[PDB]
Short mmCIF file of C-alpha atoms (C1' of nucleotides) and ligand atoms in Angstrom, two decimals:
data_model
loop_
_atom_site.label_atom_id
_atom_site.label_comp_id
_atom_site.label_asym_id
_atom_site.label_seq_id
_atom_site.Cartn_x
_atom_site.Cartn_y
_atom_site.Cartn_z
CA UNK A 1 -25.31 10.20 26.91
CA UNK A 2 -25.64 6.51 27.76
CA UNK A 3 -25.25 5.20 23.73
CA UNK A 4 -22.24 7.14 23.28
CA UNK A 5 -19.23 4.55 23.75
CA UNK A 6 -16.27 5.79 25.50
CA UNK A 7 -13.59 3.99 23.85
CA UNK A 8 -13.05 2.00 27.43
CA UNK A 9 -13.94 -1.40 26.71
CA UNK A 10 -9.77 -2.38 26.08
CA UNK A 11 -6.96 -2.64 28.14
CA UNK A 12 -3.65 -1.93 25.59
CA UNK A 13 -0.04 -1.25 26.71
CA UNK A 14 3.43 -0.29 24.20
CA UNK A 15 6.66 -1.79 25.61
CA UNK A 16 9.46 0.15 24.10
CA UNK A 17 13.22 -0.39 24.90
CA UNK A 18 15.13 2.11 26.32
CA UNK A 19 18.23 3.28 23.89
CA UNK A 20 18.16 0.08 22.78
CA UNK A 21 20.86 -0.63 20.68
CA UNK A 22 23.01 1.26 23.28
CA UNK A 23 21.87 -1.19 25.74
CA UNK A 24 22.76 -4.14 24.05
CA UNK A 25 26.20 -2.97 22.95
CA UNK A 26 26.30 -2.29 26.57
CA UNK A 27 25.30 -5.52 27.86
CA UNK A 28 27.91 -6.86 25.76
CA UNK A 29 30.59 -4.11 26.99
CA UNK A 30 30.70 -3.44 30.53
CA UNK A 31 33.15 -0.57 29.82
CA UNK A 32 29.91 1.63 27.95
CA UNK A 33 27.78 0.76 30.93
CA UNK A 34 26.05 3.76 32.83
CA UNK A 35 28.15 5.97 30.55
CA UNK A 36 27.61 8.80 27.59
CA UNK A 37 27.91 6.43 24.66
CA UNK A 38 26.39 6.19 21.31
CA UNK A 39 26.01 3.57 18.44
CA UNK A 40 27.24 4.47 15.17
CA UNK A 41 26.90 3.14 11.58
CA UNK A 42 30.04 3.16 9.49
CA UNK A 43 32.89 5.35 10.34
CA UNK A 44 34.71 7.29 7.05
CA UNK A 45 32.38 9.96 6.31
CA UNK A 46 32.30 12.43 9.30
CA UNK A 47 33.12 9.75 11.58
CA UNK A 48 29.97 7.68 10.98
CA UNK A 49 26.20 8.09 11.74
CA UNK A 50 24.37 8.34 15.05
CA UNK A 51 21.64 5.99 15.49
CA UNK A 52 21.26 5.41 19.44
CA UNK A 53 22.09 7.76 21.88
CA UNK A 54 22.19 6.72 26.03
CA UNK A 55 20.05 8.86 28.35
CA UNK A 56 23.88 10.15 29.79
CA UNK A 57 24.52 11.27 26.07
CA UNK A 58 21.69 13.15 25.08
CA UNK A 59 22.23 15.23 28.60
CA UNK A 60 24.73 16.46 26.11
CA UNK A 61 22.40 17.21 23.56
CA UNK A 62 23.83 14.24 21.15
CA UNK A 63 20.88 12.92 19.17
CA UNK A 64 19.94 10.78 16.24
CA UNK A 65 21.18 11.33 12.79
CA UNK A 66 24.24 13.30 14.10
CA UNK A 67 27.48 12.56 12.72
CA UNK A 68 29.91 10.90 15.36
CA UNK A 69 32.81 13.95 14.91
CA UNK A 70 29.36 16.39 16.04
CA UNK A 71 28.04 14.74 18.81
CA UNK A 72 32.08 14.70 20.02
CA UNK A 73 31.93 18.40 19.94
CA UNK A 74 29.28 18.26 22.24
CA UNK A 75 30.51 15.72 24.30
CA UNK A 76 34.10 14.69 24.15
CA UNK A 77 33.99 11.83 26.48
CA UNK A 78 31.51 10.00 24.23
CA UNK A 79 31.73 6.70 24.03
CA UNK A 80 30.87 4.90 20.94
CA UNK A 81 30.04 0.87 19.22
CA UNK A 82 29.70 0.44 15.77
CA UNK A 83 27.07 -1.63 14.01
CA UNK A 84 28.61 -4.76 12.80
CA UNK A 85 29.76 -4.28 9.13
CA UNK A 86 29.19 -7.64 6.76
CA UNK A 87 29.76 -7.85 2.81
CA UNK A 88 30.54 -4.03 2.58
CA UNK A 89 27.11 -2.86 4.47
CA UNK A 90 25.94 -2.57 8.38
CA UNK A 91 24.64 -5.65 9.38
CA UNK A 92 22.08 -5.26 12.55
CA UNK A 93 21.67 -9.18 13.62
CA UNK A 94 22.89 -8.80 16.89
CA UNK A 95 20.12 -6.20 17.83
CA UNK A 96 17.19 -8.28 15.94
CA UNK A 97 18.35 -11.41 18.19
CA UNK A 98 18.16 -8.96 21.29
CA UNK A 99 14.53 -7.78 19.80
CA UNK A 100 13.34 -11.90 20.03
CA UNK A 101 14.81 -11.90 23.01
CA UNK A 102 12.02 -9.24 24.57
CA UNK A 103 9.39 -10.62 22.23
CA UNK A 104 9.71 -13.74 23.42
CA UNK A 105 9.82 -12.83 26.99
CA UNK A 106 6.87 -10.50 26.27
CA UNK A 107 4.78 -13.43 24.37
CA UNK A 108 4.37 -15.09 27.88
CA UNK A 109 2.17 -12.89 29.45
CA UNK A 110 -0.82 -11.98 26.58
CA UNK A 111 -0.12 -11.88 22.81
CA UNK A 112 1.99 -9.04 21.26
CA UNK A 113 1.66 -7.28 18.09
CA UNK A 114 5.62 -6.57 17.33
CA UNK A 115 5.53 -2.39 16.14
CA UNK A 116 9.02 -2.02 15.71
CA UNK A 117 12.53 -3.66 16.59
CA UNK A 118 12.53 -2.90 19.99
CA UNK A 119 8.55 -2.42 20.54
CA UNK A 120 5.68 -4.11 20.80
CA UNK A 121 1.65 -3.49 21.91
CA UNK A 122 -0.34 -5.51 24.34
CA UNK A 123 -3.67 -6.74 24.63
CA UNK A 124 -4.56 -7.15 28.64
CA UNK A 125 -8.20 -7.53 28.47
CA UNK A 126 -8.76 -11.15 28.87
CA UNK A 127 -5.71 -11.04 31.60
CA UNK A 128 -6.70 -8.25 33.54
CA UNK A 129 -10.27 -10.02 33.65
CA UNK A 130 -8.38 -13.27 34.91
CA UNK A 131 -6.28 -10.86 37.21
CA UNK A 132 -9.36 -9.12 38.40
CA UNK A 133 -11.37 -12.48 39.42
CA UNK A 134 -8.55 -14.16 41.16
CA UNK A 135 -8.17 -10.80 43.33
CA UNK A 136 -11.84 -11.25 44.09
CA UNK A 137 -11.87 -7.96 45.78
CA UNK A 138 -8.86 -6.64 47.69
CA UNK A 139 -7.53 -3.06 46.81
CA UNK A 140 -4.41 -3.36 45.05
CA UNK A 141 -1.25 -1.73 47.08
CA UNK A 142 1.44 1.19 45.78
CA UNK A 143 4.20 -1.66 46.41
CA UNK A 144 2.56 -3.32 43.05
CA UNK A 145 3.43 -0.02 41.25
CA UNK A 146 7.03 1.32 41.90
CA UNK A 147 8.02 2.35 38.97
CA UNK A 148 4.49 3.65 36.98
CA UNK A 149 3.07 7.44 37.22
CA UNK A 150 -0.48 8.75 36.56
CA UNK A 151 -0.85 10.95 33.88
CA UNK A 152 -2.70 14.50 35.12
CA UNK A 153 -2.20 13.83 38.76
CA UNK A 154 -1.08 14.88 41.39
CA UNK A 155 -3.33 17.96 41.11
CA UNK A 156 -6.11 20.14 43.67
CA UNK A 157 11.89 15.46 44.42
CA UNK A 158 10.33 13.35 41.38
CA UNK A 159 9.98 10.34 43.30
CA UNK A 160 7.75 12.39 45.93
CA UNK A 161 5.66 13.86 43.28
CA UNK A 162 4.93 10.27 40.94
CA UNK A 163 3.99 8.70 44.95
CA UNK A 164 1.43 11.49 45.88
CA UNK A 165 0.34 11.12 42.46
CA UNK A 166 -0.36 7.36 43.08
CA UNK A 167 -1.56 7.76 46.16
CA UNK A 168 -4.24 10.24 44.91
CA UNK A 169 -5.29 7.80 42.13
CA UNK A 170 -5.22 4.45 44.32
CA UNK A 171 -7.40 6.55 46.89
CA UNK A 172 -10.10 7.04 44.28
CA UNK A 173 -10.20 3.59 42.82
CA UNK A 174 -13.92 1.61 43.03
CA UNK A 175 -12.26 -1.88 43.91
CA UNK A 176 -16.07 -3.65 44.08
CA UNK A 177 -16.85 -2.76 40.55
CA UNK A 178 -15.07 -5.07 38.34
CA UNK A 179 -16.13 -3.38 35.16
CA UNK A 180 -14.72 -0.42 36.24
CA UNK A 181 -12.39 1.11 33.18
CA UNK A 182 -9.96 2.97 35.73
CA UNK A 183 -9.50 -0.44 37.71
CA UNK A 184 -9.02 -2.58 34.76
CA UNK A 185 -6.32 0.32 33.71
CA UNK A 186 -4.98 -0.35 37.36
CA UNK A 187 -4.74 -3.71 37.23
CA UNK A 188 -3.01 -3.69 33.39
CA UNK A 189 -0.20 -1.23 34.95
CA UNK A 190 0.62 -3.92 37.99
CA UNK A 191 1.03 -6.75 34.70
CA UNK A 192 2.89 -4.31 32.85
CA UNK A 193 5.17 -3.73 35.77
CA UNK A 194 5.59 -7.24 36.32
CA UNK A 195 6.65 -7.80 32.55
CA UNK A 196 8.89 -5.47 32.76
CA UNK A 197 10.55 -6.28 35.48
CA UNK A 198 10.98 -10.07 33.84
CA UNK A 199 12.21 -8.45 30.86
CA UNK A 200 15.01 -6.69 33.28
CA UNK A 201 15.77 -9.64 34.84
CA UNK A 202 16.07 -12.08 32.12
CA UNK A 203 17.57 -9.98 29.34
CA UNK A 204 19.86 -6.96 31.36
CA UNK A 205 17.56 -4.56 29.30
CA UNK A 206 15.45 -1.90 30.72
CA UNK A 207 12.14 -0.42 28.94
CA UNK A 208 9.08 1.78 29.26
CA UNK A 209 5.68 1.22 29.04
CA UNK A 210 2.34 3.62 28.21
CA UNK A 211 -0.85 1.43 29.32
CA UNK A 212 -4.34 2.75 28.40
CA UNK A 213 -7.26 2.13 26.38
CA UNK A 214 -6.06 1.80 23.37
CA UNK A 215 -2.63 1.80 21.10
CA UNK A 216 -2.32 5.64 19.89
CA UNK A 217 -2.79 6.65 23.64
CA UNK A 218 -0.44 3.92 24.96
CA UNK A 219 2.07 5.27 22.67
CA UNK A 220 1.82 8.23 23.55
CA UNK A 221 1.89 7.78 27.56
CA UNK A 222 4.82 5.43 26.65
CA UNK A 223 6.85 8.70 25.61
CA UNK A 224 5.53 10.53 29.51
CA UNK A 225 8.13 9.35 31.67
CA UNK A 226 11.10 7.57 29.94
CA UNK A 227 13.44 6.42 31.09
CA UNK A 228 12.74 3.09 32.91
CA UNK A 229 9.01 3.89 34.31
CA UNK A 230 5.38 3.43 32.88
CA UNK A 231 2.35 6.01 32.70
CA UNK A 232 -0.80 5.47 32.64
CA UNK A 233 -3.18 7.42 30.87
CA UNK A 234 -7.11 7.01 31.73
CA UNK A 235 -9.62 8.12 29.89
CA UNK A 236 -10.69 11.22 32.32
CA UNK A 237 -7.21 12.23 31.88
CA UNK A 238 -7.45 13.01 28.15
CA UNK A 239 -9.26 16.12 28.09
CA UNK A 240 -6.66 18.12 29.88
CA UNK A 241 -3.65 16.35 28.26
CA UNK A 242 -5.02 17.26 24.49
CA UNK A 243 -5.24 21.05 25.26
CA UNK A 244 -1.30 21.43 24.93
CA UNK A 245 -0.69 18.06 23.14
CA UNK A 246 0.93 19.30 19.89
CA UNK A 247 -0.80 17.74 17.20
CA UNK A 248 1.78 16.30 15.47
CA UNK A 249 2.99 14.20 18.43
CA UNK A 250 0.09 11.32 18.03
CA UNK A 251 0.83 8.87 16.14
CA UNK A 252 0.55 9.02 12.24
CA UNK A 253 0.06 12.77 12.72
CA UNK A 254 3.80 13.73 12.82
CA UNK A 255 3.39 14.28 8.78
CA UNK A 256 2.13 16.21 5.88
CA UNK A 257 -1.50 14.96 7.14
CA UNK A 258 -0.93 16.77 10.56
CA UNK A 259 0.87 19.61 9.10
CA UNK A 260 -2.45 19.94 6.66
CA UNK A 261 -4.74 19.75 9.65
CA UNK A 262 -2.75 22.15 11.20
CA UNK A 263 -2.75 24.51 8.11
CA UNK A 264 -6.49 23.69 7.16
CA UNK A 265 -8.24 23.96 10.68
CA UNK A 266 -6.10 26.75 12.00
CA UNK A 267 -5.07 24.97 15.53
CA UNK A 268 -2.45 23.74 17.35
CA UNK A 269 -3.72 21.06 19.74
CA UNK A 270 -5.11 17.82 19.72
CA UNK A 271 -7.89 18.71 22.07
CA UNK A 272 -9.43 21.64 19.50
CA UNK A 273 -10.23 19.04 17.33
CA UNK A 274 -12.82 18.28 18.90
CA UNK A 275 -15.07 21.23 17.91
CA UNK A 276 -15.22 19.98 14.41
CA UNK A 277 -18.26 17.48 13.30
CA UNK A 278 -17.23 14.15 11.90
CA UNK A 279 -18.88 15.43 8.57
CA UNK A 280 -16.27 18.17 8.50
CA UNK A 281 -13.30 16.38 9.33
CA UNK A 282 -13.60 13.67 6.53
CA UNK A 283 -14.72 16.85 4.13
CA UNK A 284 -11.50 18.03 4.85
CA UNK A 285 -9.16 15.10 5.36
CA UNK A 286 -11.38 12.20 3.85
CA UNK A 287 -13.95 9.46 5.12
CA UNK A 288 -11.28 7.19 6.71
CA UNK A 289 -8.81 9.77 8.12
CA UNK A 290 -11.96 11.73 9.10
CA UNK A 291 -13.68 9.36 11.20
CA UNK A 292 -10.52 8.79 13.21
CA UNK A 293 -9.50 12.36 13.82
CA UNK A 294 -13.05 12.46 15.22
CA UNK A 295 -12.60 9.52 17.99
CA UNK A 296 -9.05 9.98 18.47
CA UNK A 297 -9.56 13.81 19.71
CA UNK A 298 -11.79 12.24 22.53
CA UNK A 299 -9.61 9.56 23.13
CA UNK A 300 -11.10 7.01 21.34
CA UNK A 301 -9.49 4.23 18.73
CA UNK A 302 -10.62 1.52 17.39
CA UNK A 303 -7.32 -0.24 15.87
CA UNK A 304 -6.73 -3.81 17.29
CA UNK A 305 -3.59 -5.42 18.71
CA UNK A 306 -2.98 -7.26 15.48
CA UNK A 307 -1.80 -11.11 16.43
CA UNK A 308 1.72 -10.94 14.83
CA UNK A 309 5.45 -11.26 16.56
CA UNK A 310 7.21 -11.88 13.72
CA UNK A 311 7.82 -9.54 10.63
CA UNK A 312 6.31 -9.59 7.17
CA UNK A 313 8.90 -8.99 5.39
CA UNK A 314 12.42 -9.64 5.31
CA UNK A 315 14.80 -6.55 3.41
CA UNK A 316 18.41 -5.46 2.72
CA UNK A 317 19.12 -2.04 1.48
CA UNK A 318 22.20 -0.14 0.36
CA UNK A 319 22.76 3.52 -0.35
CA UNK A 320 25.62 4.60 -2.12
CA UNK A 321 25.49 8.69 -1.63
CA UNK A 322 27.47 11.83 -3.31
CA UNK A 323 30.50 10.24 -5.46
CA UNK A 324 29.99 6.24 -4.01
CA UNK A 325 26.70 5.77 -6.75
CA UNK A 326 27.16 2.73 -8.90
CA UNK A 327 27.99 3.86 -12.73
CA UNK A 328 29.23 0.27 -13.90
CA UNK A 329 27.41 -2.98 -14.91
CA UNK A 330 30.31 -4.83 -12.43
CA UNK A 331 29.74 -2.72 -9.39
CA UNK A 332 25.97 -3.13 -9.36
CA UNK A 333 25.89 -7.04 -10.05
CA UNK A 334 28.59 -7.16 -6.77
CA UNK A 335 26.34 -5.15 -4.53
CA UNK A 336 23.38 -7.43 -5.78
CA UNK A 337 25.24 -10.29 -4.87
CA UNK A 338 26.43 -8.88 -1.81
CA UNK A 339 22.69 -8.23 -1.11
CA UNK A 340 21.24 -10.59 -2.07
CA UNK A 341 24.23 -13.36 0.13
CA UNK A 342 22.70 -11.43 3.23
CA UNK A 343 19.14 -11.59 2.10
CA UNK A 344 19.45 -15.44 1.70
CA UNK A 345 21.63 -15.51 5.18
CA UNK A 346 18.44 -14.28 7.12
CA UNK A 347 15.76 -16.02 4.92
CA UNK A 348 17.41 -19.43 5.45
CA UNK A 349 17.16 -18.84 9.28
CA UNK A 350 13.87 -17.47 9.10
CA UNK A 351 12.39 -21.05 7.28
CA UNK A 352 14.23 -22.81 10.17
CA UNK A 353 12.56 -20.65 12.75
CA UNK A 354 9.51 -20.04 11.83
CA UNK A 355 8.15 -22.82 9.67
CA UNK A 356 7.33 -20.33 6.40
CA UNK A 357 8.75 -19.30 2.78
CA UNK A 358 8.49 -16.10 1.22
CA UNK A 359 7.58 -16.04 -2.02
CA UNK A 360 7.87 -12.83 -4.16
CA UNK A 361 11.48 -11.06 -4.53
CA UNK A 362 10.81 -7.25 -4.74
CA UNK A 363 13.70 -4.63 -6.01
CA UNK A 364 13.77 -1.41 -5.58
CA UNK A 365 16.39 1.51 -6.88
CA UNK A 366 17.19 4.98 -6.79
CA UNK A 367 18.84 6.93 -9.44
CA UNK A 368 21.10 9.91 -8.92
CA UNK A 369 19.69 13.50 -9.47
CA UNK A 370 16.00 11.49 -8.61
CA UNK A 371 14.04 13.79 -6.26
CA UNK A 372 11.98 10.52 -5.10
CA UNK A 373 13.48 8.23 -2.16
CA UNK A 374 12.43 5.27 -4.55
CA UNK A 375 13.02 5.38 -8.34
CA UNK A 376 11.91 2.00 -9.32
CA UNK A 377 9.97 -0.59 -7.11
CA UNK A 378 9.37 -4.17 -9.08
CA UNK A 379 8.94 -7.85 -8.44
CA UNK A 380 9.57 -11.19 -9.73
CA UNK A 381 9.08 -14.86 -8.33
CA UNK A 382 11.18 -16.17 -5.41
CA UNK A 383 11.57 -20.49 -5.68
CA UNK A 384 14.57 -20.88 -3.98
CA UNK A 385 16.87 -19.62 -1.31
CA UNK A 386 19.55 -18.84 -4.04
CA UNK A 387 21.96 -15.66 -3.66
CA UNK A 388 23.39 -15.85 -6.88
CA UNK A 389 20.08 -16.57 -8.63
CA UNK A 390 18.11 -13.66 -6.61
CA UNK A 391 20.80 -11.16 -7.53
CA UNK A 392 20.51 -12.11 -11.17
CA UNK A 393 16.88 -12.13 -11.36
CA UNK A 394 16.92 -8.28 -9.93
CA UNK A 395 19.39 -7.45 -12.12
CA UNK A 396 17.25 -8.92 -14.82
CA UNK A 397 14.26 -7.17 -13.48
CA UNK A 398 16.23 -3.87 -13.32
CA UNK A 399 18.81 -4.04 -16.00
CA UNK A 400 16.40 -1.60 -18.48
CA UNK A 401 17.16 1.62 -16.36
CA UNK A 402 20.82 1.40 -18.00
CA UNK A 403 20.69 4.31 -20.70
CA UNK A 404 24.24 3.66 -21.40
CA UNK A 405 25.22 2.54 -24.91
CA UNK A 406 29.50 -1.94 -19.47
CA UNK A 407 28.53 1.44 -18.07
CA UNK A 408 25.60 2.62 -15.89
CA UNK A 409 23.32 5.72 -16.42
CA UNK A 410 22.35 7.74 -14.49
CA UNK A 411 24.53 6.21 -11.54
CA UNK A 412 22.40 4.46 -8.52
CA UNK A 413 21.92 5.73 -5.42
CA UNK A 414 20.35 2.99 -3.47
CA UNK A 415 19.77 -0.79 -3.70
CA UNK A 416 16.72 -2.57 -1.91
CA UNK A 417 16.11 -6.42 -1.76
CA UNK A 418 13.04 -7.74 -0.07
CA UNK A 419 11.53 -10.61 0.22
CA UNK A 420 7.36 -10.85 0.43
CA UNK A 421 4.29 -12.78 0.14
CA UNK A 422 5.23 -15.38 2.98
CA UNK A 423 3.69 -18.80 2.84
CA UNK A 424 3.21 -21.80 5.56
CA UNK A 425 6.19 -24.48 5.05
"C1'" DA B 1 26.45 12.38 2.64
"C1'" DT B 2 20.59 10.35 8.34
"C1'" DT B 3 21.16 4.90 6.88
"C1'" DG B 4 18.65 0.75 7.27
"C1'" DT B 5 14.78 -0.95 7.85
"C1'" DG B 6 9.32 -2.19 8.25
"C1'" DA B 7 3.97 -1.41 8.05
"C1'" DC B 8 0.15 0.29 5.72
"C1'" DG B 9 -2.80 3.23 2.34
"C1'" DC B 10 -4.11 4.67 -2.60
"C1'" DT B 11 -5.16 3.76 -7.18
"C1'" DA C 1 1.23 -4.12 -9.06
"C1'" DG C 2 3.70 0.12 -8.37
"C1'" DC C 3 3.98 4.32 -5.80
"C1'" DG C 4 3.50 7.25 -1.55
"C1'" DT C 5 3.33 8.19 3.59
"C1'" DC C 6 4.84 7.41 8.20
"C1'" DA C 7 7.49 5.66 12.16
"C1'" DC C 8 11.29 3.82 14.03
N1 LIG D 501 16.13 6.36 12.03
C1 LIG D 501 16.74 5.23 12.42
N2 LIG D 501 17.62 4.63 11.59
C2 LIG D 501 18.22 3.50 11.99
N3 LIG D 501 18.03 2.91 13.15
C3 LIG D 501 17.15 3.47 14.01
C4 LIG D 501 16.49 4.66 13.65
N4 LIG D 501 15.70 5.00 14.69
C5 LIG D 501 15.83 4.07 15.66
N5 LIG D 501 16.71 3.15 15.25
C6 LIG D 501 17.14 1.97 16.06
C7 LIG D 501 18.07 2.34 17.18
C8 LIG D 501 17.18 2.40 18.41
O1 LIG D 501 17.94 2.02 19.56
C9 LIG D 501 16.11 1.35 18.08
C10 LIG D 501 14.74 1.70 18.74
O2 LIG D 501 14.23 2.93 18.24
P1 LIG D 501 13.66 4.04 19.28
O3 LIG D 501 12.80 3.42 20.28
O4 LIG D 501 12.85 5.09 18.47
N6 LIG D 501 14.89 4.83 20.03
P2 LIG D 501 15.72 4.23 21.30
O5 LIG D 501 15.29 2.88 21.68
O6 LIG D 501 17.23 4.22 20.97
O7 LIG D 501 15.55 5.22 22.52
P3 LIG D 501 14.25 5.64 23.45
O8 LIG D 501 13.05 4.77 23.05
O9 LIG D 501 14.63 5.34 24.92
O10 LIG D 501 13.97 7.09 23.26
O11 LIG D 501 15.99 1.33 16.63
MN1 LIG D 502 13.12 2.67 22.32
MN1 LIG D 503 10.86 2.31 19.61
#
DNA sequence: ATTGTGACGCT
DNA sequence: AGCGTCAC
């Protein structure tokens, strides 16, 4: 009853891009704007691989992963960018300069954690607060809302249906109690629409937003209403949207741990969870993973909006597929070196930037005929921003996998350079 | 012949 | 440290 904590105490939104490579290419291309168009990676095989699709396109049915000469028999008017191609492998600066670009914008208003490329989470608390006190009091108007919805209402033309749904939630709100959950939620959605709309104006690019109580349920509520709107998802709303939530449509869940909860517990839904007692969900699905199946079927997480906008590692990665796999000592020094030029490329600029040098080189391979997506993960020391050193140190760390007896065997499948262990310079 | 990433957990 | 899972 009153010692039972609701898992209300936080105001957290997700920011997430809208096709976002497709926007950029499109920012930089007039011709693909408000168009079905695509970005692709590479071109030869099959006409290359999807890996953004505009809202236009996937009216079509064109999706991610689909090869180009596909998605054209769907739709033959697609229009389509390719990634930029650098030392003989797709090169994706242009769309991590974009991504700083929205961090940076997004940094302004309350401190980000950066989730992906193109996304990042939100902690509001302290700014709603500050929001909340300078209001001292007045009720806060649909024109500070035009573009957000309200998850499970309106209840008892889309446009008509997301107003009345406002209009039934603003009517409800308790203005004079400034500890209020659902007002704090309020007053997050009118900063979240006013960072996005910066975002739009300063950059050209157009995103979502989920805002709620926490970063699974943003996340989720992110997903409601793309594109180019914001839901928010209260905590009285949860009950009813967990009875048909699929399970493995929350975050972490999409996997062989949902599939197994699925499988073990004999439901469908988020909401049945909740008939199970802590004590038999970590029985089942251990301690950690048990605990927060229990909170996060009532809406409840604990995870915090970790205080990092930059990444934690910086990677390059080849795959060479079917008949491409590297079977000489030449052609896997070359792709090293090519590596390991565009490795040193981005870690030069990142010391510049941000004031740090990472430390530990880590290589990874995979071996033709290998089931696993990695076949060899080690690490060595990293002293110095050196291309042709860092490709001859992995090839020194990896150079033992070679069962020939100036051949390679079995042939590799996949390079992977990254660079770890960052320290303050 | 989804590719190229990036974060986090387990032992 | 090296491997596995998960999203993005
Ligand atoms: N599997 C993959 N492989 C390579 N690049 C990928 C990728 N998945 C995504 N990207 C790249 C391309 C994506 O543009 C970008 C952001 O990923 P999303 O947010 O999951 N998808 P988007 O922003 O396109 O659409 P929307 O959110 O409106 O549904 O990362
Ligand atoms: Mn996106
Ligand atoms: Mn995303």
């Amino acid at each position: 009853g009153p010692h039972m904590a609701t898992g209300q105490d936080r105001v957290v939104a997700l920011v997430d891009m809208d096709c976002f490579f497709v926007q950029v290419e499109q920012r930089q291309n007039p011709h693909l704007r408000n168009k079905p168009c695509a970005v692709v990676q590479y071109k030869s095989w099959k006409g290359g691989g999807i890996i953004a699709v505009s809202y236009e396109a996937r009216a079509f049915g064109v999706t991610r992963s689909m090869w180009a000469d596909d998605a054209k028999k769907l739709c033959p008017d697609l229009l389509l960018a390719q990634v930029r191609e650098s030392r003989g492998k797709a090169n994706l600066t242009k769309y991590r300069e974009a991504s700083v670009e929205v961090m940076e914008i997004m940094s302004r208003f309350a401190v980000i954690e950066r989730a992906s490329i193109d996304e990042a989470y939100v902690d509001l608390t302290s700014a709603v607060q500050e929001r909340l006190q300078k209001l001292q009091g007045q009720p806060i108007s649909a024109d500070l809302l035009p573009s957000t919805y309200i998850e499970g209402l309106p209840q008892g033309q889309k446009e008509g249906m997301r107003k009345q749904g406002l209009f039934q939630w603003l009517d409800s709100l308790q203005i004079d109690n400034l500890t209020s959950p659902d007002l704090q939620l309020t007053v997050g959605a009118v900063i979240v629409e006013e960072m996005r709309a910066a975002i739009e104006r300063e950059t050209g690019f157009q995103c979502s937003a989920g805002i709620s109580h926490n970063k699974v349920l943003a996340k989720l509520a992110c997903g409601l209403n793309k594109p180019n709107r914001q839901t928010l998802v209260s905590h009285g709303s949860v009950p009813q949207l967990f009875s048909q939530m699929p399970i493995r449509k929350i975050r972490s869940l999409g996997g062989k741990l949902g599939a197994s909860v699925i499988e073990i517990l004999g439901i469908e839904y988020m909401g049945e969870l909740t008939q199970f007692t802590e004590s038999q969900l970590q029985s089942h699905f251990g301690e950690k993973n048990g605990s927060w199946l229990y909170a996060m079927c009532r809406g409840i997480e604990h995870d915090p909006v970790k205080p990092r906008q930059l990444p934690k590692t910086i990677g390059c990665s080849k795959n060479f597929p079917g008949k491409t796999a590297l079977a000489t000592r030449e052609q896997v020094q070359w792709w090293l070196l090519q590596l390991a030029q565009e490795l040193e490329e981005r870690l030069t600029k990142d010391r510049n930037d941000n004031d740090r040098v990472a430390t530990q080189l880590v290589v990874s391979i995979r071996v033709q005929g290998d089931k696993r997506l990695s076949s060899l993960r080690r690490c060595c020391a990293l002293t110095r921003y050196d291309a042709h050193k860092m490709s001859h140190d992995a090839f020194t760390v990896i150079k033992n996998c070679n069962t020939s007896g100036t051949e390679w065997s079995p042939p590799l499948t996949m390079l992977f350079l990254c660079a770890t262990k960052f320290s303050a310079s």
